[PDB]
Amino acid sequence: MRILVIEDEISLNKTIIDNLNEFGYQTDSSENFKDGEYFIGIRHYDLVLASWNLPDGDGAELVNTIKHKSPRTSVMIMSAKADKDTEIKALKAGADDFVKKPLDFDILLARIEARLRLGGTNVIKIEDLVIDPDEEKITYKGQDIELKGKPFEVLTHLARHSDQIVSKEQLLDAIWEEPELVTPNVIEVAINQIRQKMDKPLNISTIETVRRRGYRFCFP
Template identity: 60%
Template sequence: MRILIMENDVQMSDALSNLLSEHNYQCDVAESVGDAKYYLDIRNYDLVLLGWPAGTPSSSLNVIGEIKKNAHKTSVIVISERLDKESEIDALRSGADDFIRKPIDEEILLVRIEAKLRFGASNIIEIEELIINPEEEKIIYQGNEIELKGKPFEVLTHLAMHKDQIVSKEQLLDAIWEEPELVTPNVIEVAINQIRQKMDKPLDITTIETVRRRGYRFCFPKKIG
């Protein structure tokens, strides 16, 4: 599970990142809205922790709407030192899924995150007869399960989540590999080839097209020719 921490308090963001990493969550930290938008453009997040400092206007919660618009299945938990009931109401009405007050009880935070991820909206992708279930790493086409696991599955899923968009090799590396700087772009070509060999050819469909010099695009499953 991947979590984006939007918190301009460096000490707090470091503490949250360390806590979540210890519990096997993959974390990115954004200290500004600009940084957050960059991460949200290249990666899929299951949950966003949004810091809302005292003294900042309610309009700063508008970012929640932007997150939900582009990734409606992503849960958002607002964390804030604000104690008044009105602030919690503002956050929830702005689209937040939960509101947690500082100082944060680590056990409560972890339980709240587990609850949102467990009961949050499904990430299952359904396009006609093709079903991709990221949580179970399962693909079903016309009722039959397709054997595609690991990085090829993650590449297919990422492209499917960004259907009709061109995604570059660099974006795929950043989104999927833990340390993208340590691998070469050739691993993307290998993953794409695995998808075509294990899925497209046997099923006589096309799921991914290569856009020369730009990257790859998930295209609607269709019969070849």
């Protein structure tokens, strides 16, 4: 999952990115609405962390622009003014969460994880398939599967986004630090790794390929 930060204050923007990266997220920062708006046009972000109090934005337009271009991107607003009405304006403007500044980073990461779970649970438990992304483990029928690294991350991403196709660019954007540089075959070798150690041996078809579209996780 890729997070984007738009903090006008220089020090805060940094601290946030460092904490987020430590957790396990891919990250890009912005200090401007214009600079932000460019990023959201080149890359896909799973969540955007923006300040309502920016010099070059009203907040409400910021939240509106992003949720129009990237309609599946989540918007979390941060404000030093956590007033009742400031919050309501943000949420009404299309924000998905509102947090007060100064920040509790332990609570932020929890909400970020909840927002990227897509309504799911932390441990993804479909049938006898159990993917614990936190301990990096996949178990089917009590039997353990051995998938690790990027290849495991596209599987959880494909599972968080089940019954939906995910373009190779989004998998790149979500999991690789510099998605533009890596060749898009990294994604295909990963899917082969997954299928080889899951779909092929366990007589199943978890991932489906859709030409000029992407891949789609299924468990029918």
